[PDB]
Amino acid sequence: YASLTEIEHLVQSVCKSYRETCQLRLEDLLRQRSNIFSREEVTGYQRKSMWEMWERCAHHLTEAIQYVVEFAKRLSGFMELCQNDQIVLLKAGAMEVVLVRMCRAYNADNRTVFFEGKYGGMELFRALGCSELISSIFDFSHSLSALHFSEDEIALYTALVLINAHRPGLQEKRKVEQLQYNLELAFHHHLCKTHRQSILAKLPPKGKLRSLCSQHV
Numbered sequence: 001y002a003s004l005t006e007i008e009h010l011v012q013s014v015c016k017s018y019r020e021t022c023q024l025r026l027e028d029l030l031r032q033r034s035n036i037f038s039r040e041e042v043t044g045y046q047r048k049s050m051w052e053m054w055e056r057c058a059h060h061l062t063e064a065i066q067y068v069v070e071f072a073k074r075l076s077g078f079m080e081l082c083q084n085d086q087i088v089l090l091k092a093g094a095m096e097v098v099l100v101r102m103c104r105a106y107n108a109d110n111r112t113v114f115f116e117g118k119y120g121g122m123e124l125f126r127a128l129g130c131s132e133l134i135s136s137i138f139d140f141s142h143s144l145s146a147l148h149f150s151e152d153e154i155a156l157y158t159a160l161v162l163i164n165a166h167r168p169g170l171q172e173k174r175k176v177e178q179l180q181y182n183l184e185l186a187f188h189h190h191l192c193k194t195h196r197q198s199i200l201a202k203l204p205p206k207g208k209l210r211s212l213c214s215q216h217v
């Protein structure tokens with residue numbers, strides 16, 4: 001049995017872990033919305049080889065996964081788990097977490113994204129020749145953005161993307177279930193405390209993460 005202090009402690013731990021590991025601070029991201037790539041800078045990015053853009057995008061992707069791994073390591077529970085389990089959850093979840101995190105760097109006012117110090121739109125990534133993939137990411141980002149997720153809602157929802165007992169290949173499934181259940185309490189409690197119950201019915205379906213992430217892979 002988990003008590004009110006223990007649950008409130010959990011909420012606060014997951015929120016603090018995200019803040020430490022967030023990588024890009026929200027205030028900085030919002031401050032930088034005014035800073036938008038010039039036509040010559042967009043052209044510059046368009047002119048680059050697919051290979052250069054993939055190297056850059058991969059660098060950013062790998063960096064953001066490290067910050068996910070860290071976030072996990074600070075969730076009180078995760079280190080107690082066995083390594084096979086740690087690995088299964090991160091392998092299956094880490095990209096799906098980056099995708100949710102990425103929504104903070106999307107601006108719905110002008111359909112731009114933060115990339116390498118300023119904002120621009122889809123056009124930046126033309127060299128990749130993955131218009132469709134970029135379109136999904138920009139739609140999905142637009143759809144999460146509409147909900148104005150707080151830092152703590154991100155923290156908590158992100159933790160549940162990771163700590164999922166249905167992932168094939170877990171050895172201590174029951175330890176993962178106990179952890180997920182507690183994170184579900186943490187999230188649902190915090191939602192009640194914040195008057196934010198409305199979001200649940202609007203969170204993207206569990207497949208849409210998995211589906212889209214499949215496309216990336």
Ligand SMILES: CCn1c(CCC(=O)Nc2cccc3ccccc23)nnc1CCC1CCCCC1
Binds near residue numbers: 057058061102133137
């Ligand atoms: C690690 C995130 N990241 C960042 C960090 C800041 C961020 O999250 N920006 C974005 C926010 C929302 C949508 C975006 C769309 C395209 C590019 C950046 C987007 N910079 N590049 C990437 C790679 C993403 C990759 C995804 C796979 C296709 C190429 C872009």
